[PDB]
Amino acid sequence: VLSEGEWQLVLHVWAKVEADVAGHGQDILIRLFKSHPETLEKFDRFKHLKTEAEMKASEDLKKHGVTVLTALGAILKKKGHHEAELKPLAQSHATKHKIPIKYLEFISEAIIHVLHSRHPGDFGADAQGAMNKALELFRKDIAAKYKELGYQG
Numbered sequence: 001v002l003s004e005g006e007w008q009l010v011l012h013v014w015a016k017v018e019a020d021v022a023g024h025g026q027d028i029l030i031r032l033f034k035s036h037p038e039t040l041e042k043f044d045r046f047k048h049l050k051t052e053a054e055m056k057a058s059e060d061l062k063k064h065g066v067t068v069l070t071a072l073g074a075i076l077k078k079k080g081h082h083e084a085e086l087k088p089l090a091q092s093h094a095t096k097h098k099i100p101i102k103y104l105e106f107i108s109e110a111i112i113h114v115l116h117s118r119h120p121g122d123f124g125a126d127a128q129g130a131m132n133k134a135l136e137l138f139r140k141d142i143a144a145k146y147k148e149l150g151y152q153g
């Protein structure tokens with residue numbers, strides 16, 4: 001459970017992210033796809049994208065970045081009370097998209113890398129520690145629902 005002090009650190013950086021959701025989404029998804037190429041193969045709509053420059057130029061990729069960060073922000077702002085938000089997401093990513101829990105660890109590390117690049121002063125070690133904890137909670141609740149449905153991992 002995150003303390004109230006840790007939630008403040010998370011949401012304080014997230015307000016910055018919300019200044020430019022689209023730029024953030026894009027960096028995060030390009031980072032994910034470059035670091036872990038096997039993740040790009042889950043997206044039929046992005047599989048044709050071969051270079052970083054092509055990724056940077058795709059308007060549809062930038063659109064999906066916004067989609068992702070908007071659903072994440074809606075969860076983070078629940079400060080743990082995110083049951084109604086998390087449960088449709090787990091259901092679809094387990095049963096429809098077929099995303100292993102491991103890829104959610106990957107995209108968490110991408111989110112932390114980009115936050116660190118764009119917001120030093122607001123993302124020191126204490127903030128980075130609270131953001132990790134939040135993402136771990138997110139991943140742990142998703143994994144419980146995966147397990148239920150018979151996909152755990």
Ligand code: HEM
Pocket residue numbers: 039040042043044045067068069071072088089092093097099103104107
């Ligand atoms: C920070 C974690 C993530 C969030 C909040 C999230 C959120 C979303 C949302 C809200 C949608 C659209 C509605 C739906 O179909 O459920 C979606 C679709 C999708 N997500 Fe995620 N997702 C995340 C991580 C991942 C990862 C890591 C992968 C793949 C490596 C992934 C693959 C997909 C796919 C394949 C689609 C459908 C794309 C299409 O429209 O063709 N998601 N995700």
